[PDB]
Each structure stands twice: as C-alpha cells, then as structure tokens.
C-alpha cells in the first residue's frame, strides 16, 4: 500500500483546470483513480479549488448514495466475531468515519468489499450531475 501520488494529483488538477466540467472529466477521473482507497478519492477531490457550487452538487450525491447504501445493507447484530471487521456503512465507504487500514482490509477480505470502487461509482454519479448542469 501507497497513497495516491503527487504526480497523479498534478495531472488531475490539470484536467480540472482546463476541461470545464465537460464530459471528458469523467473518463479522466476514472483512469487516475484506478485502485484508489476512499482516502485517495477524497485527496483527489480536495485538490479542486473553487468550483464550490459544483463541489456541493457532488457532496449531495455522495450523501444520498451513502444513505441508500445504509438502507440496503443493514448492520448485523454484533458482537463482531474476533478476527473480523464491522461491515462498512455509507460514511465508511466515503472515507469520512473510516481510516485507511480500515479501508484496506475491506478491499482485501475474502471476498472483498471494494469500498474504493463503490465510492468511485458514487463520485461518478455526482460528476454526471455536474456535467449535465454546466454543459
């Protein structure tokens, strides 16, 4: 495990500066986030300065998706079996109430809960919302 690189981040900043919120940001965002943890995803999003209204549209979609997740994945009765992890909640998938080895476990278990891929899908839906508004 290595957190997302400065060079990857530089390229994502370059994408976001020029291409508006044009459709083309979506495929770039997907290429640059391959194998990201939720922390990585937040780190890419954090780099975006300004575009505050757009950023808020994305957050609203994330918030909506996290609550849907929670509804479709109720928490099992605990206590958690030793050698195991709590199933993730929406907030954990979005990285706000989870930590990194917390995120990596899920992504490695048998079978895995790919918390990065799930949060990526949410982000993608929020970017589509942004693109339909502005372009």
């Amino acid at each position: 495990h290595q957190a997302i690189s400065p060079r990857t981040l530089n390229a994502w900043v370059k994408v976001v500066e020029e291409k508006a919120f044009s459709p083309e940001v979506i495929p770039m965002f997907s290429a640059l986030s391959e194998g990201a943890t939720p922390q990585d995803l937040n780190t890419m999003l954090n780099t975006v300065g300004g575009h505050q209204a757009a950023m808020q549209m994305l957050k609203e979609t994330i918030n909506e998706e996290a609550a849907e997740w929670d509804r479709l994945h109720p928490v099992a009765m605990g206590p958690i079996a030793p050698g195991q992890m709590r199933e993730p909640r929406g907030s954990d998938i979005a990285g706000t109430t989870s930590t990194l080895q917390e995120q990596i476990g899920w992504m490695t278990h048998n079978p895995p809960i790919p918390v990065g891929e799930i949060y990526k899908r949410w982000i993608i839906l929020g970017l589509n919302k942004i693109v339909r508004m502005y372009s």
């Binding site: 928490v75 099992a76 009765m77 206590p79 079996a81």
Partner: protein, 165 residues
Amino acid sequence: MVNPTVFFDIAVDGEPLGRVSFELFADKVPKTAENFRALSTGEKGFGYKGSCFHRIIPGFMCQGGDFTRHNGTGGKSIYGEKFEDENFILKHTGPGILSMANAGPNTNGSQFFICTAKTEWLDGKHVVFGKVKEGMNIVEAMERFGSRNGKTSKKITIADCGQLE
C-alpha cells in the same frame, strides 16, 4: 434479593443438555436486568421459552434471544421499542458474563450473549448485565456446537426458562 436469578433449561435437538442459571445485576443495570428477567418468565406473553442460540462462536460467545425471527434479525424488548445502553459500568471480564447483543449504540432489544472467554474489547460497546451462577459447564458444552462463523451444527434451544425464587 435485589438481584433476580433466572434459569435456562438447554436442549440439543430436543434432548435435554442441562440448566444454566444467571445472576442479573439489577443493582447496576435495572432496566436491562428487568428486560431479560421478564423475557425469561414469559410474563409479557412472549419471551425466550422455545428460542434458540442462533450464533455460537467457539472461544468467544454463545448468542441467543431472537425469539421473533430465530436467526439474529429479530427480537424485541419489553419496552415496546429498542432501548438505550443503560451504562457500561460492568466489564467483560471472563467466561460467563452475560451481555446485550446490539446493532449499534442504543439499539438493545432481546438478543444477548454469554461470553466463553475474556472479551475486553467489548467494554463500552455492549451492556454487561449478569453472569452465569450455575452451569458454566453447560455453556462450555453448548460451545462445541458452534463454528468460526457462528453457524450451529444442531438446534440449541431454551426448552424452558423462568425465575428462581
């Protein structure tokens, strides 16, 4: 006495295994003790009699109390609603501790567990409310019907239960 004592007569696929009794710490967690006591007597018209230990993890705990769905997704308290974590004064100090199962803070219903080891990491997450008095060896026996993921290999039932005195 201030602290009630409750008994379970455990059966394994219909056959008698043995009795376990518990001290309920009403003097520290009266609301949570009363819940389990009343569910043990059947006095509210529902309760533990006939229900199963649906999840048994050797070297950890035996869990039961889901008398509404029999599989861990049900159970109900005597209060007409899930109820708050009363306190976390008492600790999970070893075999025999009796504690509330839950699905998050302040979600107690009827599910409970009996520890078969020290499970200190549970302190502040599950409300401890009693302890096994007689029949630890029966709990230890029950443990042999469990598995790593908790699936039991035979039906482990509370064939009868009630209050002693």
